Amino acid sequence: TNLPRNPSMADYEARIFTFGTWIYSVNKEQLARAGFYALGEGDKVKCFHCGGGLTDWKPSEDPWEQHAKWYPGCKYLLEQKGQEYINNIHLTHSLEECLV
Amino acid sequence: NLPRNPSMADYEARIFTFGTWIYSVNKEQLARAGFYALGEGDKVKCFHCGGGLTDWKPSEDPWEQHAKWYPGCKYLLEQKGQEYINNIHLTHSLEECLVRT
Numbered sequence: 001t002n003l004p005r006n007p008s009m010a011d012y013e014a015r016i017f018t019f020g021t022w023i024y025s026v027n028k029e030q031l032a033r034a035g036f037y038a039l040g041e042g043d044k045v046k047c048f049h050c051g052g053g054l055t056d057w058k059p060s061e062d063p064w065e066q067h068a069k070w071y072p073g074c075k076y077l078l079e080q081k082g083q084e085y086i087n088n089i090h091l092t093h094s095l096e097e098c099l100v
Numbered sequence: 101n102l103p104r105n106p107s108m109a110d111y112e113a114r115i116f117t118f119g120t121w122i123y124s125v126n127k128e129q130l131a132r133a134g135f136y137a138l139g140e141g142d143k144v145k146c147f148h149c150g151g152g153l154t155d156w157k158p159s160e161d162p163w164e165q166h167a168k169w170y171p172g173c174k175y176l177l178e179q180k181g182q183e184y185i186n187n188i189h190l191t192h193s194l195e196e197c198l199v200r201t
């Protein structure tokens with residue numbers, strides 16, 4: 001805090017290379033853009049800036065949404081997407097949750 | 101189209117009307133949120149949607165109230181975005197569910 005926790009993967013171009021073998025439903029450019037790079041096992045990816053790791057992407061799911069869902073403290077996220085967006089995902093999620 | 105009252109379409113004119121304000125709610129915020137005071141009581145009104153607001157309690161934030169009551173306002177939207185507005189209206193919704201339960 002507060003610099004990239006993986007400065008080697010800072011450049012989007014760098015991150016996109018790491019997806020050579022990529023074969024999963026979720027779009028690699030999205031992931032790359034969202035901050036993530038592939039780890040080299042299953043569908044596991046990790047954010048370049050906060051170092052958060054996601055896994056088991058379902059077919060509809062959006063990179064930017066999960067990033068905010070799971071690691072909403074990421075400063076890359078905040079810079080690229082702003083605070084109110086983050087508040088949004090959680091709110092939506094919390095409301096649905098309560099509605100069951 | 102959508103302007104509404106271009107005579108109060110700027111901060112300085114808006115804050116003037118508070119040259120005599122007495123109530124809890126801050127005078128510089130109301131202004132930034134697009135409101136001028138009328139004259140009667142604590143009655144205040146937006147400039148771009150003509151939203152009226154009165155009975156300001158001691159905990160209510162102008163922008164929240166602008167979105168709670170007049171969410172369509174094109175000025176609001178172009179100050180705080182779809183997200184902020186919806187976030188105000190998704191959370192009163194949450195409150196209700198949380199006290200059903």
Ligand SMILES: CC[C@H](N)C(=O)N[C@@H]1C(=O)N2[C@@H](CC[C@@H]1CO)CC[C@H]2C(=O)NC(c1ccccc1)c1ccccc1
Binds near residue numbers: 052053069073
């Ligand atoms: C960012 C990598 C860093 N090494 C780290 O903290 N990883 C984890 C982490 O941030 N989270 C994982 C939990 C164990 C780790 C704590 O060291 C799960 C996701 C995240 C986390 O704790 N998320 C919380 C949360 C909630 C509000 C603000 C910030 C974080 C969380 C909990 C439930 C649902 C969504 C988010």
Ligand SMILES: CC[C@H](N)C(=O)N[C@@H]1C(=O)N2[C@@H](CC[C@@H]1CO)CC[C@H]2C(=O)NC(c1ccccc1)c1ccccc1
Binds near residue numbers: 056
């Ligand atoms: C990304 C969409 C997917 N459907 C999803 O919601 N994934 C979540 C997820 O990856 N994590 C959340 C757990 C519920 C989900 C499991 O599907 C919390 C964080 C992450 C996770 O399971 N593992 C992380 C991690 C981080 C810190 C401690 C333990 C686990 C992780 C870390 C490195 C590499 C891969 C995952």
Ligand SMILES: CC[C@H](N)C(=O)N[C@@H]1C(=O)N2[C@@H](CC[C@@H]1CO)CC[C@H]2C(=O)NC(c1ccccc1)c1ccccc1
Binds near residue numbers: 084
């Ligand atoms: C701008 C002044 C002051 N910080 C405030 O009242 N902010 C609002 C706020 O926190 N929330 C309102 C939206 C307008 C502001 C967001 O910047 C409604 C949602 C609320 C909020 O507390 N969101 C939380 C949250 C916590 C639990 C469940 C769901 C949502 C939030 C969640 C994750 C990460 C950061 C905040």
Ligand SMILES: CC[C@H](N)C(=O)N[C@@H]1C(=O)N2[C@@H](CC[C@@H]1CO)CC[C@H]2C(=O)NC(c1ccccc1)c1ccccc1
Binds near residue numbers: 143144
């Ligand atoms: C933000 C102040 C206070 N907490 C509040 O929200 N009051 C409400 C309110 O002003 N309005 C909401 C109605 C419930 C409240 C009445 O106590 C809907 C929109 C607004 C409104 O209709 N204001 C009127 C008004 C006039 C007299 C009595 C009550 C409401 C209004 C119309 C034009 C100019 C000023 C106020």
Ligand SMILES: [Zn+2]
Binds near residue numbers: 047048049051
């Ligand atoms: Zn991140």
Ligand SMILES: [Zn+2]
Binds near residue numbers: 134149170175
């Ligand atoms: Zn308005």
